[PDB]
Amino acid sequence: QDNLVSVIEKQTNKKVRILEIKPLKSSQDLKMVVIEDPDTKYNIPLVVSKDGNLIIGLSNIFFSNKSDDVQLVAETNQKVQALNATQQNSAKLNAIFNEIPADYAIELPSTNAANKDKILYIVSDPMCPHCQKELTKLRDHLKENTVRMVVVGWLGVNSAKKAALIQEEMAKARARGASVEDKISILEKIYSTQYDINAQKEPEDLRTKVENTTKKIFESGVIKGVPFLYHY
Amino acid sequence: QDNLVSVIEKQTNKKVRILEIKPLKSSQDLKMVVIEDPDTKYNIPLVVSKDGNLIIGLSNIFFSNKSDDVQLVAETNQKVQALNATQQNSAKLNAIFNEIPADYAIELPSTNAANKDKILYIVSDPMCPHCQKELTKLRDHLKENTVRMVVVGWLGVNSAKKAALIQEEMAKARARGASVEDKISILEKIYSTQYDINAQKEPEDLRTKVENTTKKIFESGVIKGVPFLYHY
Numbered sequence: 001q002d003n004l005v006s007v008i009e010k011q012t013n014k015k016v017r018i019l020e021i022k023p024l025k026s027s028q029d030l031k032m033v034v035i036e037d038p039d040t041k042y043n044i045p046l047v048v049s050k051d052g053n054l055i056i057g058l059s060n061i062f063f064s065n066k067s068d069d070v071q072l073v074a075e076t077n078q079k080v081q082a083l084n085a086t087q088q089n090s091a092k093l094n095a096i097f098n099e100i101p102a103d104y105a106i107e108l109p110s111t112n113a114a115n116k117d118k119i120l121y122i123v124s125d126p127m128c129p130h131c132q133k134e135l136t137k138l139r140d141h142l143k144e145n146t147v148r149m150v151v152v153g154w155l156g157v158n159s160a161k162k163a164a165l166i167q168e169e170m171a172k173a174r175a176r177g178a179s180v181e182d183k184i185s186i187l188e189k190i191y192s193t194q195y196d197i198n199a200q201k202e203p204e205d206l207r208t209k210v211e212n213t214t215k216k217i218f219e220s221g222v223i224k225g226v227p228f229l230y231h232y
Numbered sequence: 233q234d235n236l237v238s239v240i241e242k243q244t245n246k247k248v249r250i251l252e253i254k255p256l257k258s259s260q261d262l263k264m265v266v267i268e269d270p271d272t273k274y275n276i277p278l279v280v281s282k283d284g285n286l287i288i289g290l291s292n293i294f295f296s297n298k299s300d301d302v303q304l305v306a307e308t309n310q311k312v313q314a315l316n317a318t319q320q321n322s323a324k325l326n327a328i329f330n331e332i333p334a335d336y337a338i339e340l341p342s343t344n345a346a347n348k349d350k351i352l353y354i355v356s357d358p359m360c361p362h363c364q365k366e367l368t369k370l371r372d373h374l375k376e377n378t379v380r381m382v383v384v385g386w387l388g389v390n391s392a393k394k395a396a397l398i399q400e401e402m403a404k405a406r407a408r409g410a411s412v413e414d415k416i417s418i419l420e421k422i423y424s425t426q427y428d429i430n431a432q433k434e435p436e437d438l439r440t441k442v443e444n445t446t447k448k449i450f451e452s453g454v455i456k457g458v459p460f461l462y463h464y
Contacts, residue, residue: 007295011302026286029261047279047288053297054258056279061289063239069286070243 003052126162235284358394
């Protein structure tokens, strides 16, 4: 219905996309319409007149003598609430990853040039055995994606210290034009359980950057643990 | 419309009261109805069919090619939101006063027996000059209301201590069957700026009761200062 779209556009400056139209037993002029907001991508359920000139948002405040309509609305509300919850979660994740300092993530381009645009974020703690296991899969992940590994100081003091050393060592590696393999070796070297962490001097500046970056990744509770993988 | 009321009753077990019915330029079958929820007393705006068999809650998600309908809905939404905000505030206040220990308030029956049922709550700090001024009006308030004076320890340590002494002294006064005048004299005695607060031994138990009671009165920020008067 162009009319409904146009009615909404004029008074919101949002051009909505129509996803679903269903009839109501309970009225002859009114139809059930779900639309997509072009900004938030939220799915929004509506009751709309035949000519598309009257548009009312649907909510839990819906009653009918027709049980089928009550049911239709219930199913619709619940379906859109599940879709919108996921959409909001994705957007929160995107915002988390966009807020990380630009030099912080270690970006390793896929071994296959065809796949360079496929972005996999991996949030990883260097004192975590599950992250150590995940690290062994990195060369395989590269075949299919470009990986942005985000090394956090999440599990304790030694995590933060290792994350700091990784930041310092990656800066030097980039400065000298190190290869993908060189960067992975740096990660394996430092992730190793036998890596003598106390035998290293810890750069103070970088530890604070690690502490701040890590705090903000885990702040909202949208990310609750590691290794956390996210296809962007 | 009995039908709408009955449709709602069957599926909510709430019998709503109809407050307002208005037509929409934008539809011939649909009317704008505001109802009162019998539990919360919240005013709820609806779009309702002619036969009262379809009922849709109104919200900000409302669009029409008819600017008058958009306006009607806007005015209606804003009016009910203002009424419901006040209703919620009253109910929060009632809950604050119902949560105060039963012996805590000092209830003084009106000097006029006709007015004994008219309840005035006065939240008052004994170290507050504005509360001291309010205290001078107490005998006049009695002519018109029964006053429940709630003496808090809100402004500092001396407030809490005086509130404690007031609690202790009111307990003794009640135990000996003291008059209204006797209780007011106790208040005036202790509210007096010249009342030597440090020359008194402070009951420990009562100070904690004062501290807890006071914290809970002021917790929500629905009551932000003293003297606070509330007709219940």
